[PDB]
Design an enzyme around this catalytic site. Structure first.
Site, PDB file in Angstrom:
ATOM      1  N   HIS A  41      34.595  48.402  39.352  1.00  0.00           N
ATOM      2  CA  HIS A  41      33.289  47.767  39.569  1.00  0.00           C
ATOM      3  C   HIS A  41      32.318  48.621  40.415  1.00  0.00           C
ATOM      4  O   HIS A  41      31.212  48.138  40.715  1.00  0.00           O
ATOM      5  CB  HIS A  41      33.463  46.354  40.147  1.00  0.00           C
ATOM      6  CG  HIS A  41      33.855  46.294  41.595  1.00  0.00           C
ATOM      7  ND1 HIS A  41      35.129  45.959  42.002  1.00  0.00           N
ATOM      8  CD2 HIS A  41      33.134  46.467  42.728  1.00  0.00           C
ATOM      9  CE1 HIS A  41      35.183  45.950  43.323  1.00  0.00           C
ATOM     10  NE2 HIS A  41      33.984  46.255  43.789  1.00  0.00           N
ATOM     11  N   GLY A 143      32.176  46.769  50.909  1.00  0.00           N
ATOM     12  CA  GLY A 143      32.421  48.196  50.870  1.00  0.00           C
ATOM     13  C   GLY A 143      33.860  48.622  51.076  1.00  0.00           C
ATOM     14  O   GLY A 143      34.137  49.829  51.060  1.00  0.00           O
ATOM     15  N   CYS A 145      36.426  47.991  49.081  1.00  0.00           N
ATOM     16  CA  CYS A 145      37.204  48.160  47.863  1.00  0.00           C
ATOM     17  C   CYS A 145      37.537  49.629  47.643  1.00  0.00           C
ATOM     18  O   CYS A 145      36.787  50.531  48.032  1.00  0.00           O
ATOM     19  CB  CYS A 145      36.456  47.583  46.669  1.00  0.00           C
ATOM     20  SG  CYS A 145      36.378  45.791  46.761  1.00  0.00           S
TER      21      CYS A 145
END
Ligand SMILES: *C(=N)[C@H](C[C@@H]1CCNC1=O)NC(=O)[C@@H]1[C@@H]2[C@H](CN1C(=O)[C@@H](NC(=O)C(F)(F)F)C(C)(C)C)C2(C)C
Ligand SMILES: *C(=N)[C@H](C[C@@H]1CCNC1=O)NC(=O)[C@@H]1[C@@H]2[C@H](CN1C(=O)[C@@H](NC(=O)C(F)(F)F)C(C)(C)C)C2(C)C
EC number: 3.4.19.12
Lengths: 306, 306
Positions: A41, A143, A145
């Site tokens: 993503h 942030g 991930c």
């Protein structure tokens, strides 16, 4: 003596973290040899995450659309591909600090260390367990991930988790390093909920052995029990069934302390039926289930890594 | 969201650990530039530790009597000196991985990460607090001495603790990196005991703010209190007095959540007088006092390090 929630040393993994930016979305990547792994993503706008078509979004990207930064240095992307929920960016430079490593899919109840990162930089390290409902109780912000979970075996880093999202009640979900989610979750911003969690019985028993090794013995009773009778009581209190495989894994701690596993089970049974009567075990007022038998052996015997 | 006991990333410190052997005693050393720091009782036999004369034992040693190993490589000792309870071994090679660093003496209530090591190799990392009685609740075995505690500020490692010994009830004591013990303890194998410990009030308040930030708000009451009235109640329950300095340090969390410090104090007062009624806060059944206000800000805001 003493017993603490211990994480693995994070140095080998720190040397693999980079930041990946696509458009205005920035998250963390894992740089191993000449490949950077990161959550797919990264290619989404905030709008796309409500219902992304990742295949469609990736067609319209080329290599130069990915900005990969390793410290002060930009790594040129020279190829890309998607594997389930992770993107693999081939870069023109192999990471010279790549440790000996493996990609593993862990089982519920097993533990690992998380190196929480932002913008490719480490914030902290903590120990987690894969819950029976396939979530983890982490600490993650926007942030985070692409932060990874791992175990170390001497010099080999076994990567087992990439962070992707947060679920209601503040628990977390992600994938193995092949991009396959743990649990029935999807990387889409839509209402999702974990199922009812359960207590990891074999880990509670391991931690009771850690307590005995440290001289915290008040809960030991004079009884034994059968495996079947214990599992009937555990079922009522939302504890996972104890299997013969679990009994075998507890063997080393049982032999070290001279307490048969089924005797420990009888002591745990009494704690479940009666409570701890405002007493503590290893400083905790609740039974702890995020130490595996190996975690206890590694901490109480001083196992080191290279 | 989520809140865990987070340690600093350990990579910068891992690169500084070596093993120091003198005779048959082996422990850990910290290699910074061309100096290795380690506990002075490396020069003791098991017999010497009951009543060592460290000055006498060190006269009869020369440089070649110290075997310093950094991984597979022996570092030649070319000078040595003793500073309080630490030995400083000058070696012929500067550590090329020396981080930007400082030696600091922390105050009771402040926290730090411990990199527990054996034979110069890391076993794990965990977070600790300097207790008001100048002990730490660590996890250390034989051979762990010379393991260090530290904080990181961007790229600077502030070393604050060297491990030396274990006290009754399984708590631990050591020195700053100038070899001065925290507390009234000595590096001799003779009966010693820590004084009565107290709860770090400012840290409990910080952790209640972390709970509010994570949506765990059930304990907030509708009252306020004065600083004096709160400290009278805290005194009864063996809590440290809250100072105006502490109130000022809690300012950022108070401003972020919109809860005045003295209002939080009124909520803590009720928890002390009435208990938690078998409820949990951030998953804990006991009030936690080993998160500083900065620990909460660093975890909940995602502060990173270089
Ligand atoms: C990665 N950087 C973040 C980590 C999140 C952010 C807050 N705490 C975390 O762990 N991942 C995301 O923001 C993912 C991502 C879209 C939305 N998302 C979520 O975690 C959301 N969760 C859900 O939508 C639900 F209900 F499915 F769990 C959020 C509401 C923002 C917590 C995508 C692409 C799934
Ligand atoms: C360093 N490698 C060890 C670490 C110890 C070992 C077990 N857990 C730990 O943290 N340091 C020592 O063994 C020191 C050292 C002699 C004896 N010692 C102790 O920690 C002893 N404690 C005490 O004698 C007392 F009561 F003062 F705390 C021990 C009984 C072995 C725990 C010297 C030179 C002080």
């Amino acid at each position: 003596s003493g017993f603490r929630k211990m994480a693995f040393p994070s140095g080998k993994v720190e040397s693999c973290m980079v930041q990946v930016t696509c458009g205005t979305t920035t998250l963390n990547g894992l740089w191993l040899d000449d490949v950077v792994y990161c959550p797919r993503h990264v290619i989404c706008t905030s709008e796309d995450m409500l219902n992304p078509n990742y295949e469609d979004l990736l067609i319209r990207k080329s290599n130069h659309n990915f900005l990969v930064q390793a410290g002060n240095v930009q790594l040129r992307v020279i190829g890309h591909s998607m594997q389930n929920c992770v993107l693999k960016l081939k870069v023109d430079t192999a990471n010279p600090k790549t440790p000996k490593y493996k990609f593993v899919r862990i089982q519920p109840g097993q533990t690992f260390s998380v190196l929480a990162c932002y913008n490719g930089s480490p914030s902290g390290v903590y120990q987690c367990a894969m819950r029976p409902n396939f979530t983890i109780k982490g600490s993650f912000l926007n942030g985070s991930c692409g932060s990874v979970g791992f175990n170390i075996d001497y010099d080999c880093v076994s990567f087992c988790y990439m962070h992707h999202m947060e679920l209601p009640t503040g628990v977390h979900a992600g994938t193995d390093l092949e991009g396959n989610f743990y649990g029935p979750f999807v990387d889409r911003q839509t209402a999702q909920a974990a199922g009812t969690d359960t207590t990891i019985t074999v880990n509670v028993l391991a931690w009771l052995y850690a307590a005995v090794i440290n001289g915290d013995r008040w809960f030991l009773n004079r009884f034994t029990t059968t495996l079947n009778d214990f599992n009937l009581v555990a079922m009522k209190y939302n504890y996972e069934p104890l299997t013969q495989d679990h009994v075998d894994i507890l063997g080393p701690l049982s032999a070290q302390t001279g307490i048969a596993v089924l005797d420990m089970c009888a002591s745990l049974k009494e704690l479940l039926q009666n409570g701890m009567n405002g007493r503590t075990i290893l400083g905790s007022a609740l039974l702890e289930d995020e130490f595996t038998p190996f975690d206890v052996v590694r901490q109480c015997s001083g196992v080191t890594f290279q």
